[PDB]
Design an enzyme around this catalytic site. Structure first.
Site, short mmCIF file in Angstrom:
data_model
loop_
_atom_site.label_atom_id
_atom_site.label_comp_id
_atom_site.label_asym_id
_atom_site.label_seq_id
_atom_site.Cartn_x
_atom_site.Cartn_y
_atom_site.Cartn_z
N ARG A 61 0.84 -1.19 0.00
CA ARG A 61 0.00 0.00 0.00
C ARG A 61 0.87 1.23 0.00
O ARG A 61 1.55 1.48 0.98
CB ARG A 61 -0.88 0.03 1.24
N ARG B 151 -4.30 19.44 7.40
CA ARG B 151 -3.19 19.24 8.34
C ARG B 151 -2.68 20.54 8.96
O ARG B 151 -2.75 21.60 8.33
CB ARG B 151 -2.03 18.49 7.68
N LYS C 120 -12.49 4.28 1.14
CA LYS C 120 -12.17 4.35 2.58
C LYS C 120 -13.26 5.13 3.31
O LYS C 120 -13.55 6.29 2.96
CB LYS C 120 -10.81 5.01 2.82
N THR D 14 -7.26 0.54 10.57
CA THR D 14 -6.10 1.14 11.23
C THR D 14 -5.95 0.66 12.65
O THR D 14 -6.83 -0.02 13.17
CB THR D 14 -6.19 2.66 11.20
#
Lengths: 497, 495, 494, 494
Positions: free
Chosen positions: A52, A93, A241, A299
């Site tokens: 990935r 972010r 996702k 995760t």
């Protein structure tokens, strides 16, 4: 009667031989500690089926290496390892920090700017956030979630058009460039932003097998992905996702219009309570099982093995119950990306996956799933569920699917036989692409060399001989052979010679 | 929820179009009023699939004639009609009487004798019984049952070595040569008598398709019948007739060893209560469905149509229910042999069978049967049971089963798909022989004239074309093809 | 052990019959069974319900039946229900000169509505009582005389009251026969003015239930209720389904009536006979799921009207009526004018008992259970969960305390594998329960033996009956239920 | 709609959480939760059971635990269970000079049974309390130390009391840690002299249950009941399954004990972590089918001993213990020496609430019913049928009158989709029901509020509790049940 799982747990005994074919598939995230061919070989060997690439970080030259290395490592070991491109997405972010980090304290008042001049020199009293429309979307009273949503600042007022006065509700120290989420504001960012469009075109040329599309909320958004990949990448899979609640709420339309789901626990858990994420997982995995598209447990898997030789009790049950839920893939991030134990994590995950599986009530899955399909069903659907049913009826010890895109093998895998499924393809990129579906193993059959195989028997033998060498079938054992997709539609039960 | 028959009943409306393709199969007994090619053509045309020859009567020459005509009539119409040779058996009968009958009145004393001298000139006061060791096997106090046991004599003593003093208990008048039953004595007769053996060899030479063996009680007697058939008839189907209580008891070992069963209600009824025989039927028919071998609802079917233009409100329910129990076949005896309405009887039975069948929960059969198979099952067993499961999943309007011995057709037939089953054979006898297996049609495929067909696709095409022209399938309709013995299933998108 | 087929493999005909017939037998009274001595025999042969057919005979006649049944039943210390079967919207032909007619085929004949031709009709011209016949019949229509085995076809109007008719089917006809008119509006009221008086007679005489003839509407039932008055609010209304107009409506008709009778014969007039069988299945399965009584109706053991033994098929017919799920089986001519009334019933017992004791009891309980809307009403759950308790414990009897029967009828709905023993203060409940299968009713006189505020006294009497009929012994389990409030015990029979 | 897969498709996290926690929480009292002030807080956070670990601390100590638990729960007017967890046959090492050892790899080290080394041990030679150690161990054997994470290999006997050992694994080990000896007959009795004394203290202080340790055998349970004696007959014995010998004998053990605790920690010692997960399922499902309480046991929310929040995995692990089917979840050190004792329980409650309110209830009810032998005894059937009623009626609460609590426990077994409210005259039943999921007790004082012969007062108190907890309203249905006899009611709540 032997109806459902409870009844089944009563027979099970941990001392019995670990029935040996691991159905569950492992994805690893490549990064600093696993980019080398040498360390990739180890990953393959420990049990990786998917590499990935995480496009949130690294240039194209970076990922290009990850691509070249994976290929070379895989070629040296003579296996097929699917490459997956993971979208940056509509990420928000913070900037960087002077010294390592912050030290956000509770009572504290602090400032947050969308002024880029503060990126390279951020501080715990004032710092950067790259989302340019931040101060045009946030009201005082709102909270800004930072660093996996573990740090919460309430917004107090506008200092300037670009800076925000903020109170600090939680308190913990935070590293460079962290995940920011703004609950209760329409984040205008597009699911495939300027950068992603070029990231995805890079992926098509380089011949990735699948995309892990980040922060999908819309059925419409999966559309923006497909379009950005272009017709030159019509065959690449889109694995959406799910990261926010908008995504959970719209799981159905997203599944109906995608190729598969990754259930990103970490991110959901940013503003969803952690205990509700557990249920969310169950719901997502099972919706995928029913739909028959691949689903990936996301995760914080074996989190403690990033820095320790051995996982914690709980982490183990988390992997096992992921398999029990009905996961196709478990996945590791940091643990192999930057981890100090990249082989050991994968090995240990493989073991837990093997075990859990061999204790599952394989049958019920099939039965449950069959009972939910809309009758009248499409030939190929019936063709498969009957073959699987035949496996159960005859106690057949392996299945050979001749499948060329994957459709068949994937739609068989849907019905969960209690045996290994062996897919035989003239398409190499199918082999790769079937590394996200549980229980299938792919044997490549080269049409350029070994002929066109009209009578279709040459490929079937190839599947059995593989199955035979793996230990699944011995002289005498039964074997369900299926082909689906005017010819199409066809099932034999073979006596393994 | 839609689990079982009760549920299914709530949805059914008698006013709905009657699902065409009568699954059940009809057996007729040829006799004086149906032996003519002319009459047989009407029988076939009326709905007959199996021509039963009752060897309890008539010389070989008679039945040679039956066979020749059955064959020629069928050949003229271009159809395949199976010929059953029904065994005489371990039969006890009385002799003849002077004038039509006897006239047994109640507390009367009579004499029953084993002396053949009295065979041609018997009387209500004394008459003959052909079973020789009668006196050597009967105690005083035993009942002698006569004429489907409706007349019961009680035995009082032996007048001499050959004659028995009897008292008459029931009163009824009795015709020439009626069936005699001795309850509670060892009827020592062989299940294959010396006469049976010649009849059976006559069977093998004329190429009958099956034996309807009468009075089977043993696992081992079915053996006796096969051993008599010889190796030249290793392929002839044995249908065991269950006619007595020693028979019902051993039904399981008998089924496991024969090719099918006939539930003879009339004979069971000789000394089993009628109400019980009803349940007997139910058991034997279900025991045979799960076993997957044919079962025939046997006797006194549509009885009043031997001599009336229309049957009785009861006779009909009795037929309807035969199909409901799950019979493969329904058989007529007197009605077509001596009957005054041989066509109308078959036509009515045809029509009843179609109706009941088209109101049955086909699925509950399939599933009920599937859930009674010991897992793991043999490949072809699964191959078929899943091929049916494919039908229900796709609402496939037909099935094409390529089968050479009929084994596969028969095994699919066992799992009761809710559609016509079309078998294709390269053996003609398989076509005849399938006429006792329910809801199956056969298409013959001449491997001599039309090539040996390797790819087995010329054959499928044929099976499909048939179905297409019977009305079963169109363009767009799904169709399930299966071959076993091996193992292969397709789902065709009929174009 | 899912289904009957599976269950069939395990049965043996040589295993003892479980002694308790659950199906109920209804006998029609007429010349040969009206006397107290004849009725005593009928009761003891196993009759449960006296059927008076009001199509024939005066009140005085029916009054005699009512008095004699009462007197018979009393002398044997049993309770016997009394049905008033209705005449209704019948159309009958007139009388004939000499026995009958002899309709030959190609014949032209004449059918009048003029009353003059009633008592003196011939095969060339004969009466039909339907006044508006000629006003509702186009030439070309068929008339169906005599259970519809004589089919006339209308040719013209000779006058306002007379029809030219060609004869199609040739068979001779008795006096006064059922005339049916396929494809015409038979304007006849379901409850007619002559029916009104009949119903009220029954109300005064205390009949327990009506067999209302020729029901076509949900509404028609209303007409029967509205006529029974508020004084007959308690009288049960069983709807007879006698035509395709009523098969199509069966649904709303069940939802409104107290129970169904499946009149195969009169359905069979224009519905092809084979379908009648299916209709029979549908009606019974429908009533069963509805938990209301259903009677398998006509042409039952039909040859035992003149013969001592029935025909093979006449047995399967009865046996299958029990598997179909019927509560009751009926006899008409067989007991009304029959030569063997006692023997007729005595077989029907035997056949019922036989069929019933081979019939998979569980598949019924489960089938009906798995068809109830959830959430179900308390009382409903109470019973089903009790019948569930019965199967879980292998309890050998049940005791239902019901005052109206409601509770008992709701228990009987879910088909336990044991006898249900109802205990009541109302006598009319004992009678009324004679048409619901698997129940036996014990009278508990609130007058003489006190009111029973503990319910402990009635229950002892429940078990005590059970114990006496050889259902339960010391050691056995008894499920005790009382619904409507909502209580269930599992007793260890002392 | 058959299984969990089908149910999972409907569920949404945003559907409001169902407000009843069935799962029960046990806390191990320790140096940080022994004060009444701290015990109040625990109870308030959701503790139902205080566990006294007898591996540590004097009688005096546990006397203090017993007195405080008592006083805290009295002050809060709640009924809180007191469990005595047994030391059993523990093998432990001595103490070390300094804090601990620091076992580096392939280094030779010595092991004595010589007491004079217990208080002053080193990483080079240290004490182990099992005396027959050297009589029972071969060279080539492994000594497991500290829940598995330190393996020594036995090399030779230095003397009668000292083993030469190579160090295989490298990790440092604190004071007095657990020793295990795989492939050695560890001979120590299951109930030792010290445990015999311990148990009698339990009996004298009115503990409600024993948490008996290292139960290997069906008849060792026998020894625990023998030590408890006739004066403690009514104390429950919850066997702890801790070694593999106990996973094999679970069958014989369950059927002979009162309940099972699942000690993942010690099971995890010689049984590979991933297998323990499965053993957990197997052990839990077994108890559910047997109808006996099962407790998920060790390393639960382990990080919350030192941290204010659990990890992602810790949460999953708790959640899944409910999905697996546990009655109880336990915290050991987290509430014993913990730094966030209340918050530990709080977070745990919350998890158990979430998991459960997405846990397909009906599949448990059927999975268990379809696994009970037929014919079941009256009280078994009375309870299963009660629950079946709960489902058919969508009844919102149950009410059990149970004195010893058998019937409550036996109802809980069938897992209704509603809360169960148990009503008892016996106070100790209230505490003892603190370990069966989805049950709450109401104490009915037979001494102050009369005897209540007709049970009617007790049912009211049942329904009132229900009513005041927001379970049932004026309108909702409530299933009332009393077994052992055998009576079920469906009440329309007034």
């Amino acid at each position: 009667s032997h109806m459902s799982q409870l009844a089944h747990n009563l027979t099970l005994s941990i001392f019995d031989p670990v029935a040996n074919y691991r159905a569950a598939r492992i994805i690893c995230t490549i990064g600093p500690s696993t980019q080398s061919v040498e360390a990739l070989k180890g990953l393959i060997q420990s049990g990786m089926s998917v590499a990935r690439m995480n496009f949130s970080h690294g240039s194209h030259e970076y990922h290009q290496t990850t691509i070249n290395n994976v290929r070379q490592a895989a070629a040296e070991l003579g296996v097929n390892i699917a490459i997956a491109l993971d979208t940056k997405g509509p990420e928000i972010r913070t900037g960087q920090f002077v010294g390592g980090d912050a030290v956000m304290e509770r009572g504290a008042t602090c400032y947050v700017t969308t002024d880029p001049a503060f990126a390279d020199k951020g501080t715990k009293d004032k710092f950067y956030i790259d989302y340019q429309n931040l101060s045009k979307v946030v009201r005082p009273g709102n909270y800004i979630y930072i660093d996996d949503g573990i740090l919460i600042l309430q917004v107090q007022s506008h200092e300037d058009e670009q800076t925000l006065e903020c109170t600090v509700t939680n308190s913990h120290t935070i590293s460079d460039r962290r995940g920011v989420n703004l609950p209760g504001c329409d984040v205008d960012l597009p699911a495939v932003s300027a950068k992603d469009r070029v990231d995805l075109q890079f992926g098509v040329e380089q011949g990735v097998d699948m995309i892990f599309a980040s922060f999908i909320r819309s059925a419409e958004q999966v559309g923006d992905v497909r379009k950005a990949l272009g017709p030159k990448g019509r065959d690449i899979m889109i694995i959406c996702k799910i990261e926010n609640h908008q995504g959970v709420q719209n799981i159905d339309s997203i599944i109906e219009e995608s190729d598969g789901i990754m259930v990103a626990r970490g991110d959901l858990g940013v503003e969803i309570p952690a205990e509700k994420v557990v249920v969310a997982q169950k719901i997502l995995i099972s919706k995928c099982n029913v739909a028959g598209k691949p689903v990936i447990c996301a995760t914080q898997m074996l989190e403690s093995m990033t820095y320790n030789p051995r996982p914690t009790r709980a982490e183990v049950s988390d992997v096992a119950n992921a398999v029990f839920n009905g996961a196709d893939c478990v996945m590791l991030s940091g643990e192999t990306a930057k981890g100090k134990y990249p082989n050991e994590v994968v090995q240990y995950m493989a073991r837990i996956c093997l075990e859990a599986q061999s204790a599952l009530n394989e049958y019920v899955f099939f039965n449950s799933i069959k009972k939910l399909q809309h009758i009248p069903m499409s030939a190929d659907e019936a063709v498969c569920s009957s073959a699987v049913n035949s496996v159960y009826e005859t106690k057949a010890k392996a299945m050979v699917v001749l499948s060329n895109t994957g459709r068949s093998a994937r739609l068989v895998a849907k019905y969960r036989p209690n045996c290994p499924i062996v897919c035989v393809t003239t398409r190499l990129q199918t082999c790769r692409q079937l590394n996200i579906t549980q229980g299938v193993e792919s044997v490549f059959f080269d049409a350029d060399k070994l002929g066109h195989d009209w009578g279709k028997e040459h490929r079937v033998a190839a599947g059995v001989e593989f199955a035979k060498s793996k230990g699944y079938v011995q002289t005498g054992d039964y074997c369900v052979v299926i082909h689906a997709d005017g010819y199409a539609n066809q099932t034999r039960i073979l006596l393994v010679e």
